[PDB]
């Protein structure tokens, strides 16, 4: 059962100060290897709001940043420090689990 | 002779191919297929009497049995005979791929 | 091409496989008796004794109304020639003693299993006359469950067990034939054909046209037209692409059996098409049905030309046949 | 796969061959047959769930659609796969003869 | 229908029903006639020694037992007495399938 993920590149949306959002990605695909998991990155800045969802190896880093919580089965937005713009990252190992982004279960 | 044209032209109570739309995500759960999001998978349906498109000899024998024995529950069933592959477009990673899923669309129905 | 009488060189032979007994009688008067009696009176021809096949392949089965047969049976295997009976039993019970009173100088090659463990064979001197043999059998064992006089064939199917629809006492008649006790004969029927002069190719197109499949005037029912595809020699094996164009206006059920041949096989016929068991499928058989196939020697060549099943290797028209044989040489 | 051996060996609610006695004179109306007076023409019957002997890709697609849409009335049917001839004896004039009526006995069933 | 007739085709065989209005041929052989032109024929012979019943697929044009057929179109085998000296002789012919199976001498009860 190969894992399914959204493989859209950097896009623009209106997800800011919201409890949940949708990736709005029209591409659903099988990653190259079943070991890979879906990873979502949020890097909003003063220029514009940016987000991305791709496949990535759980043990490999993205942009020289280690995804320590890649083993989680659900994509939970966790803050990561980065110069220039704030970093938010999540990863998930089930099928098509990066379609919807959940910032926090608090409601 | 029970092709798509014959059954789609007018109503036919006996074994015929009937139009049916299959949406992958909603119907089959195949969330791995990007294009097409749905297609037409017609289905065969309709009782088979003696005077109809029976293919083999066993079908004719069973039809005769049912004709001489109404309450028997044994009769040939309307089943696919001509199948056409469905063109699909699916992504692996960032790579698009065009495939022809073999035997996905029903074009003709027989009685067996 | 030109249609001419075919010879051994023609790639398709048009044998006819028929089941017949010269005479016989089946009697139910052995239910009371402890042992069933099956008597076979074989007949030979005037041909050379050396040319006569010394081997017989007596098949034993239970009748359709009996799942397994558990009852002592005595088989009287009478023939005016010394024979070896290659028995082949199916669905017969184990441990029940059985007797085979064969003619003098005849040996029975029982198959392996429990059957050969409780089978006694005795060579005797049965008379070469139907009435005398039946009288001897009746005197020795009361009543015969079955008697059949038949020509010496390669295969002789016998279905044991008493059927109560049979007459109480045996009465031999020429016009009697029950599907239990019969023989299997292959008669090479004459037919026309022609072979197109072609260079050796991996693609072969054989067109087979059949006029009359069976002698019954009720030809609304399918008949099995068994096609044998075997090489000229088993070793070395041959891998090829066969395109069998089969045509018969009357309804038939062309059955394709291939042995010791590899490759890709396609069959095109307006009637039904079938294949044998997994032991009978030596090639990647794929069936193809087209009701547009014509029914003449001329039109069929044009049909092959139009449909791309070219070049046409061989053509064979058989007025009456049902056991086509296909010999491929190399 | 679903041959007579397995179906007669153990009762199965799914698509399987079931014993049936086709009586020539009484049922088929064929008075021209002298022997056998009636034979065993097993008939295929039984629903086809997705976890079963599904042969074609369209069969799997229809099974999935039926599973995810129970109120559809469209599903693969139980039909013969391998059929075996029946040897009969009939009289022409005063001469009996043996014919092999092909495709009359069902040996195995399939879902399609 | 151009299909050949179905007729009982037992040769001369002994029966038990004598002089009765109706009887069954009790012939275990039902045969498709050799030629499509043929029709079913039944011949009942009665002697002081033994009684016999014969059934055949016979051409209506050709006379059987030197006797011409005048009822080939009959749906059922209307048995008719003939004038064979000495022995009692009845013959009938019909064209329905297995029509010679049932023999009727008189329709009256």
Residue numbers in the entry:
A (entry chain D): 10 to 116
B (entry chain A), D (entry chain B): 1 to 112
C (entry chain C): 4 to 333
E (entry chain E): 8 to 116
Report text from the authors:
Betaglycan (BG) is a transmembrane co-receptor of the transforming growth factor-β (TGF-β) family of signaling ligands. BG is nonetheless essential in vivo, where it binds and potentiates the activity of the three TGF-β isoforms (TGF-β1, -β2 and -β3) by presenting them to their signaling receptors, TGF-β receptor type I (TGFBR1) and TGF-β receptor type II (TGFBR2)4. BG, and a homologous co-receptor of the TGF-β family known as endoglin (ENG) which potentiates the function of BMP9 and BMP10, are transmembrane proteins with a large (approximately 760 amino acids) extracellular region comprised of two domains: the membrane-distal orphan domain and the juxtamembrane zona pellucida (ZP) domain19,20.
To decipher the direct potentiation mechanism, we analyzed the TGF-β1:BGO:(TGFBR2)2 complex by Cryo-EM where zfBGO was replaced with ratBGO. Indeed, mutation of ratBGO Y248A nearly eliminated the potentiation effect, in accordance with our model. The structural and biophysical binding data demonstrate that the binding loop (BL) of ratBGO is not only the main structural element required for binding to the TGF-βs but also potentiates the binding of TGFBR2 through direct co-receptor–receptor contact. The potentiation is mediated by expanding the binding interface and increasing the affinity, not through allostery.
